[PDB]
């Protein structure tokens, strides 16, 4: 596993990526983690250029998201403000 830190500025249409996963979401294996499914062309994430599809977000700013429902990790990403530190594993 690789561990990466990615800081993003929030754009007009948000961070520019989608997340699947969470403790309440279907998945194969023991793997219930939040992960990237899509990065939008010309979105903040694609412009930063570091984030990739399938990335596992372990942490959003100072809020842990490794053992939360899909809704807790969505809210954490929505409430995180204008500058967002994503701690990921790929």
């Amino acid at each position: 596993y690789e561990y990466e830190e990615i800081t993003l500025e929030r754009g007009n249409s948000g961070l520019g990526f989608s997340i699947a996963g969470g403790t309440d979401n279907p998945h194969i294996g023991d793997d219930s983690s939040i992960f990237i499914t899509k990065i939008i062309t010309g979105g903040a994430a694609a412009q930063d250029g570091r984030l990739r599809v399938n990335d596992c977000i372990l942490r959003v700013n100072e809020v842990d998201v490794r053992d939360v429902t899909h809704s807790k990790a969505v809210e954490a990403l929505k409430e995180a403000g204008s500058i967002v530190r994503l701690y990921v594993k790929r």
């Binding site: 961070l15 990526f17 989608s18 997340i19 979401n25 279907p26 499914t37 899509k38 899909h70 969505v74």
Partner: peptide, 7 residues
């Protein structure tokens, strides 16, 4: 991955 929310 039944639920996918765009952020």
């Amino acid at each position: 991955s039944y639920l996918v929310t765009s952020v």
